[PDB]
Write a protein that binds this DNA or RNA. Sequence first.
RNA 1: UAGCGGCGAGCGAACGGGGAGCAGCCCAGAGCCUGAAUCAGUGUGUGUGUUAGUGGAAGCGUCUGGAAAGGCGCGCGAUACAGGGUGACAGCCCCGUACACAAAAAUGCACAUGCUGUGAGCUCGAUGAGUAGGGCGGGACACGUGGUAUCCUGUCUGAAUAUGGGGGGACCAUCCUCCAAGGCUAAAUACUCCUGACUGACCGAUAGUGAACCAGUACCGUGAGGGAAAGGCGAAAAGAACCCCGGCGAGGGGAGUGAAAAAGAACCUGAAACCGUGUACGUACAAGCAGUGGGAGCACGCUUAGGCGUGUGACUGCGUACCUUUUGUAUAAUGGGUCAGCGACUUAUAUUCUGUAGCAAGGUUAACCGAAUAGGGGAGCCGAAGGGAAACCGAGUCUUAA
RNA 2: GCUUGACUGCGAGCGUGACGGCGCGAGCAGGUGCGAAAGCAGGUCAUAGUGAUCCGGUGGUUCUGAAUGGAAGGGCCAUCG
Lengths: 144, 201, 117, 64
Amino acid sequence: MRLNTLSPAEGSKKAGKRLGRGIGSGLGKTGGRGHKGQKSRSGGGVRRGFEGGQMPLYRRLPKFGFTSRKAAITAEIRLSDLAKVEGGVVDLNTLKAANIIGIQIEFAKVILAGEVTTPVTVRGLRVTKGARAAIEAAGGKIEE
Amino acid sequence: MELVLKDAQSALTVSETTFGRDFNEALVHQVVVAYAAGARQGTRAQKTRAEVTGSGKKPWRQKGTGRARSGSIKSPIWRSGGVTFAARPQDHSQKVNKKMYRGALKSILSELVRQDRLIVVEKFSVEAPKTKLLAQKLKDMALEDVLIITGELDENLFLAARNLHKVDVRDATGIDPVSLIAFDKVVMTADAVKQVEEMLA
Amino acid sequence: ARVKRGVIARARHKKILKQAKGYYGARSRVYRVAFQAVIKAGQYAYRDRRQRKRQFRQLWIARINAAARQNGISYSKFINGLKKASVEIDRKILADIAVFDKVAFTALVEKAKAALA
Amino acid sequence: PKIKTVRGAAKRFKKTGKGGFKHKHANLRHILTKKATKRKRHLRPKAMVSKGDLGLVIACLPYA
RNA sequence: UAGCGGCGAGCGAACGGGGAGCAGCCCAGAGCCUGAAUCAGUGUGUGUGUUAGUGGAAGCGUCUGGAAAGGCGCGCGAUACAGGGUGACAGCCCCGUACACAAAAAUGCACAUGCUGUGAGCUCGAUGAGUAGGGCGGGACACGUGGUAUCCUGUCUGAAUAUGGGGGGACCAUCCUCCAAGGCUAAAUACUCCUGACUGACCGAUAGUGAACCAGUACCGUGAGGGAAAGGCGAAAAGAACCCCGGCGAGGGGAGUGAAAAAGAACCUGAAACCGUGUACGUACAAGCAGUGGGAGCACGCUUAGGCGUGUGACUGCGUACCUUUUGUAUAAUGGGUCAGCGACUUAUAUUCUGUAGCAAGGUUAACCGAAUAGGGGAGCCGAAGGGAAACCGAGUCUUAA
RNA sequence: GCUUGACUGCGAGCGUGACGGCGCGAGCAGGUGCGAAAGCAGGUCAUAGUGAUCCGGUGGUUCUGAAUGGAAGGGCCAUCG
Ligand SMILES: [Mg+2]
Ligand SMILES: [Mg+2]
Ligand SMILES: [Mg+2]
Ligand SMILES: [Mg+2]
Ligand SMILES: [Mg+2]
Ligand SMILES: [Mg+2]
Ligand SMILES: [Mg+2]
Ligand SMILES: [Mg+2]
Ligand SMILES: [Mg+2]
Ligand SMILES: [Mg+2]
Ligand SMILES: [Mg+2]
Ligand SMILES: [Mg+2]
Ligand SMILES: [Mg+2]
Ligand SMILES: [Mg+2]
Ligand SMILES: [Mg+2]
Ligand SMILES: [Mg+2]
Ligand SMILES: [Mg+2]
Ligand SMILES: [Mg+2]
Ligand SMILES: [Mg+2]
Ligand SMILES: [Mg+2]
Ligand SMILES: [Mg+2]
Ligand SMILES: [Mg+2]
Ligand SMILES: [Mg+2]
Ligand SMILES: [Mg+2]
Ligand SMILES: [Mg+2]
Ligand SMILES: [Mg+2]
Ligand SMILES: [Mg+2]
Ligand SMILES: [Mg+2]
Ligand SMILES: [Mg+2]
Ligand SMILES: [Mg+2]
Ligand SMILES: [Mg+2]
Ligand SMILES: [Mg+2]
């Protein structure tokens, strides 16, 4: 193991393309840009979504819906996250302390995702009917 | 696993995951390369056609003169013109995952004990900060090119090694991947190896 | 990391100019003209490695035709006679025999005339 | 600098589960009196972006 | 992201979180106590800088060579093997370097102290009006007048005044929160004409500053302004005494110096185009991209009877340059007089995919801290759940009375 | 003659388009007309009679509502320029 004996992994350091360096390179004299036109020019090319003048897709379709400001303060909690909490009893504060939900989360819902093994006391959280059964099946307790 | 000391002739137990794992050359190579990149200063620059001192005046009119059309005396085609893609001061430092860095040290340390390039002693010190003493001590151990790693950095040992070219001392926390590879032998005190294990989990 | 091109550029210009030794005028002196002359010379050489095989066979056939008519038979009937006699001597050898050994060539004509008759 | 989303596209395409995009149908803003109820009914539900147009949408919504 | 936006191109927050840094005060007024905190000015002393400096270790022999610092041998110093120079590459020749010291005088910063000015503390009062707000016209807020809060004001108006007023994004009620129309305030931040030290996977004379050189010069322009070219003898000038040709020239030949003068100042190396002298061969009856295949003869090197190599090339088959652009070019379409040097897919940040490496239902930190590539820092970001415009529900959900 | 199927929600499966789209459609649910009944009817023998998006209007709406209750505005459904 010397400084002049270390070698990178096979196929991890592919060489980059070098355009316009002769015929043998396969990329000479045009750099793979074709012959003429807008796309062959330096800085050439059309912007995103441009379709040649036809009404682009994101303009011929209607806008729909609105953004809910309550969805930004609502999170979902998996069953597998109930064991990461400290103390057993879970609420908004204990989930935030465990870095499970964001600091600005005001509403939290436990869903049937993952699996819970220890008795957990859920307090002040909405629980799906599937997760409610799984929590009670592990000796847990749900209180509003 | 046991690391036999050179003088006390007693074994020293160490974690097998730290000193007895396989050598991941691809992993070590990336960390060694990234360490060299971190040493780069990257202080350089050239002048584009915008920074070259000169006038924006058109050297001659567009048509009629019979010469190739020109627009600026600073053009990169011209002598004394700018550089087409003039360099800027850049930062060559790469990111190394914490686990990839620590994973490379374990692969290097485990490789050293496999090459018998790692020597473990109970203690290593000199009385006065005199390079003559340290040079004599290493000759007794048949060592010329060696990296010495101690638990606490002693000033006398540090001063005595400053002028020795093929020798350098290092704290237990100051080890780096390229130093462990660059030197022929690596001498670690029993205190240093203990501190290295805590560093590498 | 600036790279000056002087050393390697002169090396490859000399490599071309060395292959152009003996060409007339600028074709052996200046690189732009010598390079075209060397490429054209390579094209001709590739083409003529195929033409050489045609020109020599054409020469052998002509010599065989001459020597055969000295014995009273044309090249056409002579070749057809040899195939009917199961002789598989090629034209490079027949033309060689026709020049350096007349009596052996006459013996071949007798063999060819027998297979025809 | 970060890529900027085409905000007009963000108000018209929603990313679905398997990476596709849903969108509202056209032809349902005005002039419905002359349109057959069957035609208008089939335009109410959201539709998926066709395979030929996914390249345009993905380019416009890099963070979707 | 939320938003703004011919809802186009584009523009683009805040709340909140993590860090660096952290400092609070005065007037709109009397009184009591009083000159008490504090700051400034101005001295003094102490400390630490800065402006000259001082000391600073340790090697010889032999070989090659013009020259030793190189080779070989045997020593020595090192808190000094940074660096530079010295007749080739020096730890020990020199200058330095590590380290240890040094100021008559001026001066920075601290401290302490004196002087001068400055006023602390307490009680009781007071609480910024053509102002807030409004109409009209503009502007600023990410926010283009929109349902448009908030801020500024050119114009016209115009309150309440703590039993009061402002804000919480039209607006109202409730609640919460703050007190405008008077000021001051260090640090964390931005920058480098300039000074010193140090560093470079920066340049090395067409590069790097325009300028390595007496360069913003020569030169150009009425002027503003524009703006070059141009580095290298040798270790040391030891820069060629003297002689000869020549015009008491230029230039040259000797001599001499030197390791070298084919290093002679038009001076290291000395390429190519281009121009010559000499030799070998060809060439004055022969038609064209000038080569290529075949090939005699001649010259020469051989070996040697090897019958090979090299140069030339009578004669002969075939054969209309290159690039670009084109359906298509010998084209009489474009471009190139030639040579030498330079001259064009980069960089940064995002994003996606592939490869590869680490870890894996987890992965990873950012700023920042840190004798700092370590370690700390998990603020965050992505992923493990989706459906719906949304409330919401959730391995389902939406659609619908179903 | 009698009538309002020129129905509401859907829709197996196809046709035709680069796409935006356009077209055909048995059957299912709800409710209805004609017929004694089997049945037929989601406009007209078929193929032309048309205009994306934005912006805005009108009606509805067990959606949203920037401290909270409302509202404004927005969304969704129907429809207009
Ligand atoms: Mg093209
Ligand atoms: Mg072109
Ligand atoms: Mg074209
Ligand atoms: Mg967090
Ligand atoms: Mg330049
Ligand atoms: Mg780190
Ligand atoms: Mg053939
Ligand atoms: Mg509508
Ligand atoms: Mg001295
Ligand atoms: Mg000394
Ligand atoms: Mg409000
Ligand atoms: Mg409070
Ligand atoms: Mg220059
Ligand atoms: Mg040069
Ligand atoms: Mg200039
Ligand atoms: Mg210049
Ligand atoms: Mg003279
Ligand atoms: Mg010279
Ligand atoms: Mg003749
Ligand atoms: Mg011909
Ligand atoms: Mg043309
Ligand atoms: Mg073509
Ligand atoms: Mg044409
Ligand atoms: Mg042709
Ligand atoms: Mg031409
Ligand atoms: Mg011509
Ligand atoms: Mg022309
Ligand atoms: Mg021309
Ligand atoms: Mg029915
Ligand atoms: Mg009936
Ligand atoms: Mg009809
Ligand atoms: Mg509200």
